[PDB]
Design a protein around this ligand. Structure first.
Ligand SMILES: C[C@H]1[C@H](O)CCCN1Cc1ccccc1
Ligand SMILES: C[C@H]1[C@H](O)CCCN1Cc1ccccc1
Lengths: 265, 264
């Protein structure tokens, strides 16, 4: 992969692997989420990151995901090349937004798009804090000045408020624990794992007869290695809508909430 | 990736991804196992497999892993290119062996090597079948005639018999269940998942202070989506461990194996 001509966005081509596909022989939504994560890491690496600025390191601050919104039109098949283009943009003192456009390398058509809201956080105390002006100036030079949105639409579902699932849930998957494969280089549970845990409570019949089109996911608290998660789901609807809730099986502490949208084949 | 000049082996270069590395910022053994699986799929695809022969489809025979042996000298770091070369060889009507050589694309040195024993079985009855001569002739043309072994040493770790762990186990990880990420395109639990489940019973203290050098794994029975696994481990010693994966319920054995670790 490489930075584009202006140096304000990054592109990368991926070949879909045999272990990355599902029952329909197309890439899973977790595989797509991993490729978005990977191209985002390479974008940071190509612009000078190790991903913290000199002020972020000085203050013990890190970038944490607060919301992930992914919309897929066509999942790449096993052996196909998928080109992902990513870029960042400042959302003032709120945080940063990172967007992605998934294209087909053969036809050039857009087969998917994603957006994410990132916030600043003290690595040691987990206290979420606003982006200071000194940190903002250090990374603004790598962002387009004019707004470039993957989801620009008058009323996009990427900015819609998600409600809390009320008990009893229609479906559930209980006793979900992470293994060493679910952790990242810093020993924290990977953000893609939460997507897989959310989808575990969707019935197998829905998966076998429908295709996942849209997935919005709010990140509230992070799951430790020694934590057990419960995935709860309820239908809220030609298409199928679901409300989701991940929570610690013990006290019932909320870690994630979200919605998925599916369509018939 | 592509077939080599003779068409008797396949090579492929992989760039280690950020999500594929562990706390030491090098590729995990499960990542390496996935890359071996991937290069093996592409080798079959490049020789005419749309992964069974015409007689295997006609009958209902599939290739099933019986044993996986992996030895790593250096794990590639995040962002490094790793070149894997794979090839097949016939082991008579007993089965088929697939070998791999992991090389560094920058220096050309061998940073790891793997071997696996594959057995034929009926997709429907799951009965371990022998390999017929008709099937043998259909794939022998893609294998070197003279033996080409990644582990040629007379009486080595890859062909050593593995004993059954006796209760009580020193360590354990219980209630392990597979999720949709653990299944493959055919809905069966991926062979790499068992490696990850075996290593779940190794204490975090051992992982944090040691590097996994050798891993041998016998595959006895498949774990279904609705099955719960128990990972049991005992030190038998560098550090040596004996492993056992079994169904949480009846205690039915699904996997047995050994790992060898080195101090950093
Ligand atoms: C930490 C990452 C995250 O992926 C999205 C938000 C910020 N980004 C850092 C970055 C990378 C390239 C250019 C400018 C800012
Ligand atoms: C199914 C696979 C398995 O991965 C290893 C054993 C057999 N192999 C098929 C193959 C591919 C290329 C050349 C000859 C035989």
């Amino acid at each position: 992969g490489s930075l584009t001509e202006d140096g304000l966005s990054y592109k990368e081509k991926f070949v879909v692997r045999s272990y990355e596909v599902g029952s329909n022989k197309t890439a899973t939504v977790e595989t797509i989420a991993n490729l978005l994560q990977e191209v985002g890491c390479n974008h940071a690496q190509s612009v000078g990151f190790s991903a913290t600025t000199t002020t972020m390191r000085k203050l013990h601050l890190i970038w944490v995901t607060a919301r992930m919104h992914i919309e897929i039109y066509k999942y790449p098949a096993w052996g196909d090349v998928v080109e992902i283009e990513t870029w960042c943009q400042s959302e003032g003192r709120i945080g940063t937004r990172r967007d992605w456009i998934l294209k087909d390398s053969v036809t050039g058509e857009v087969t998917g798009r994603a957006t994410s809201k990132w916030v600043m956080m003290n690595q040691d105390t987990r206290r979420l804090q606003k982006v200071s002006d000194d940190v903002r100036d250090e990374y603004l030079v790598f962002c387009p000045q004019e707004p470039r949105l993957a989801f620009p639409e008058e009323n996009n579902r990427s900015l819609k408020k998600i409600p809390k699932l009320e008990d009893p849930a229609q479906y559930s998957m209980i006793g979900l624990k992470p293994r060493r494969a679910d952790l990242d280089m810093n020993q924290h549970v990977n953000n893609v794992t939460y997507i897989g845990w959310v989808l575990e409570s969707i019935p197998q019949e829905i998966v076998d007869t429908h295709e996942l089109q849209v997935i919005t996911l709010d990140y509230r608290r992070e799951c430790q290695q020694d934590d057990v998660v419960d995935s709860l789901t309820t239908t809220t609807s030609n298409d199928s809508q679901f409300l989701h809730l991940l929570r610690l099986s013990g006290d019932g502490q909320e870690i994630n909430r979200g919605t998925t949208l599916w369509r018939k084949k």
